[PDB]
Amino acid sequence: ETGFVNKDQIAKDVKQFYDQALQQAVVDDDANNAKAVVKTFHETLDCCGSSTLTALTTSVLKNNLCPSGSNIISNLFKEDCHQKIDDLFSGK
Amino acid sequence: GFVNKDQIAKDVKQFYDQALQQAVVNNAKAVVKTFHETLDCCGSSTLTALTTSVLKNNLCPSGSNIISNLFKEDCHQKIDDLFSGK
What residue type is A27 in one-letter code?
Answer: V
Distances (CA, A) of A18 to A14, A50, A74, B2: 6, 9, 21, 11
The length of chain A in residues reads: 92
B15/A7 CB distance under 8 A: yes
Elucidation method:
X-ray
**CA pair distance B29, B57, nearest whole angstrom:** 10
Judging by beta carbons within 10 Å of its beta carbon (0-12, 13-18, 19+), is residue B72 exposed, middle or buried?
A: exposed
**CA pair distance B23, B10, nearest whole angstrom:** 20
| Shortest Cα distance, chain B CAs vs residue A21, angstroms | 10
Is B81 touching A (CB cutoff 8 A)?
Answer: yes
Backbone angles phi, psi at A67, to 5 degrees: -65, 155
Alpha-carbon radius of gyration of chain A: 13
Which residues numbered 21-50 in B keep a CB inside 8 Å of some CB on A? 21, 27, 29-35, 38-39
Domains of chain B plus CATH, in order, are 1-86 (1.10.1450.10)
Backbone angles phi, psi at A87, to 5 degrees: -60, -40
8-state DSSP, B17: H
**CA pair distance A6, A64, nearest whole angstrom:** 34
A5/B14 CB distance under 8 A: yes
